[PDB]
Scaffold this active site. Structure first.
Site, PDB file in Angstrom:
ATOM      1  N   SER A 220       3.117   1.972  -4.283  1.00 35.83           N
ATOM      2  CA  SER A 220       2.655   3.476  -4.187  1.00 35.83           C
ATOM      3  C   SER A 220       2.971   4.612  -5.138  1.00 35.83           C
ATOM      4  O   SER A 220       2.322   5.349  -5.409  1.00 35.83           O
ATOM      5  CB  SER A 220       3.505   4.036  -2.731  1.00 35.83           C
ATOM      6  OG  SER A 220       4.752   4.033  -2.963  1.00 35.83           O
TER       7      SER A 220
ATOM      8  N   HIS B  11      -1.984   1.343   0.580  1.00 36.00           N
ATOM      9  CA  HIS B  11      -2.693   1.946  -0.507  1.00 36.00           C
ATOM     10  C   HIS B  11      -3.568   1.257  -0.987  1.00 36.00           C
ATOM     11  O   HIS B  11      -4.418   1.693  -1.905  1.00 36.00           O
ATOM     12  CB  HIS B  11      -1.694   2.322  -1.507  1.00 36.00           C
ATOM     13  CG  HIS B  11      -0.565   3.159  -1.132  1.00 36.00           C
ATOM     14  ND1 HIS B  11      -0.859   4.575  -1.112  1.00 36.00           N
ATOM     15  CD2 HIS B  11       0.766   3.133  -0.261  1.00 36.00           C
ATOM     16  CE1 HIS B  11       0.307   5.038  -0.573  1.00 36.00           C
ATOM     17  NE2 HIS B  11       1.282   4.213  -0.360  1.00 36.00           N
TER      18      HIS B  11
ATOM     19  N   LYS C  18      -4.177   7.307   5.178  1.00 35.48           N
ATOM     20  CA  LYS C  18      -4.511   7.511   3.590  1.00 35.48           C
ATOM     21  C   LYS C  18      -6.114   7.363   3.514  1.00 35.48           C
ATOM     22  O   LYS C  18      -6.589   8.380   3.857  1.00 35.48           O
ATOM     23  CB  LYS C  18      -3.606   6.341   2.825  1.00 35.48           C
ATOM     24  CG  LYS C  18      -2.173   6.590   3.150  1.00 35.48           C
ATOM     25  CD  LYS C  18      -1.355   5.437   2.279  1.00 35.48           C
ATOM     26  CE  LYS C  18       0.127   5.609   2.909  1.00 35.48           C
ATOM     27  NZ  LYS C  18       0.209   5.566   4.212  1.00 35.48           N
TER      28      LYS C  18
END
Length: 385
Positions: free
Chosen positions: A179, A207, A238
């Site tokens: 990350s 991610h 995200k």
């Protein structure tokens, strides 16, 4: 007028945090998460969020929230929207195993916790990448298993640690995209080791989901992996632009989680409107609009990699939306972030223990919502610094 003396220790610790340069500021966004946002009455360009596909403010997802609440209510009180989402996720991300199932969790932390507590125990040894995010660390410590840390993406070291282990249960745990660095784990080699040693391979795609692989199905899909040893964890706040998290695995693995994971882990759930909106987000992510957003993001990444190399500072070599620029000390990093903030660019300053000592850094987070004009301004801000 009783006084709690431990308040004094807190107050002293806060002053120490100010001096050492580790003070955290929470900014209030006046407008939705997006490329351009207003903070404290000033419109700025944000490179702080993990809204990698620009979906958090997407009109179809706003509409899906409203529709979901009207259909299923405001709170969950397992709604039909949650059950449907689990079907949708299994179809989207489960291609690495036949008869995949998925489970929806309120947070990525809970997804990690459910998986590790169900599969790990006393006599289990857990092998964990050194740069894994702290939630995975916390989930493992609770598991009551022995945790061995292998050096970052160092599969030769991990291979030597695996063979030097007689544990009845072995679990390998890695983020897919790290990350704070942006690099991608060596999933093919990790899976080779997992099958050779008869271990589970649990990979956290927080991610990489939505931004890697065919149709954005994620890092496992990018690596074209097929194995029942794989357990795929992802989050939906995200790239997917809503909230929640999932575990996808062989249906026997999922059924084991349902039976053995701590029951309170299943007692928390996002509002049904959120699950309904994630189903809508999957249709965008996996469709032609998702392909177009990813292709644009790749072009932004290509420009930004060279932009960072042109500065006097050291970039982390990343091919994802996470584009870190190592400055060094806390003070020097905060000073540069403030210079960018004055130029109308919000770029977070990351500091230890989140990152190793002496590697304080700007974390530029790109989004498919950013334009080339936005990168024009980021470049001018960097060139002036």
């Amino acid at each position: 007028h009783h006084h709690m003396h431990l308040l004094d220790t807190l107050a002293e610790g806060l002053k120490e945090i100010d001096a050492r340069g580790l003070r955290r500021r929470r900014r209030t966004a006046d407008t939705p998460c997006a490329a351009h946002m207003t903070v404290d009455g000033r419109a700025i360009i944000g490179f702080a969020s993990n809204d990698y596909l620009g979906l958090a403010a997407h009109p179809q997802l706003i509409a899906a929230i409203a529709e979901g609440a009207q259909r299923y209510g405001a709170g969950s009180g397992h709604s039909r929207a949650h059950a449907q989402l689990e079907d949708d996720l299994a179809e989207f991300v489960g291609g690495f195993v036949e008869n995949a199932r998925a489970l929806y969790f309120s947070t990525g932390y809970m997804a990690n916790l459910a998986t590790l507590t169900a599969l790990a125990g006393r006599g289990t040894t857990l092998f964990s990448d050194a740069l894994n995010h702290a939630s995975l660390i916390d989930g493992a410590r609770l598991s009551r298993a022995d945790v061995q840390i292998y050096p970052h993406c160092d599969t030769d070291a991990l291979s030597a640690m695996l063979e030097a282990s007689d544990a009845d249960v072995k679990v390998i745990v890695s983020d897919t995209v790290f990350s704070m660095d942006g690099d991608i784990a060596p999933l093919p080699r990790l899976l080779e080791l997992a099958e050779q040693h008869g271990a589970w391979l649990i990979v956290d795609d927080a991610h990489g989901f939505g931004v890697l692989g065919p149709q954005g199905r994620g890092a496992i899909a990018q690596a074209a992996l097929r194995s029942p040893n794989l357990i795929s964890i992802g989050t939906l706040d995200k790239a997917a632009g809503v909230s929640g998290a999932f575990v996808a695995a062989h249906e026997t693995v999922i059924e084991w989680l349902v039976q053995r994971a701590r029951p309170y882990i299943f007692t928390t759930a996002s509002v049904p409107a959120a699950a309904h909106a994630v189903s809508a987000s999957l249709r965008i992510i996996g469709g032609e609009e998702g392909d177009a957003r990813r292709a644009h993001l790749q072009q932004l990444i290509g420009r930004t990699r060279a932009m960072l190399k042109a500065t006097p500072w050291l970039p982390v070599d990343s091919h994802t939306a996470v584009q870190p620029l190592i400055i060094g000390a806390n003070d020097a990093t905060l000073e540069i972030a403030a210079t960018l903030d004055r130029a109308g660019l919000w770029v977070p300053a990351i500091r230890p223990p989140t990152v190793p000592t002496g590697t304080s850094r700007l974390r530029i987070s790109l989004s498919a919502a950013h334009s080339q004009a936005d990168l024009d301004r980021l470049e001018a801000g960097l060139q002036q610094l």
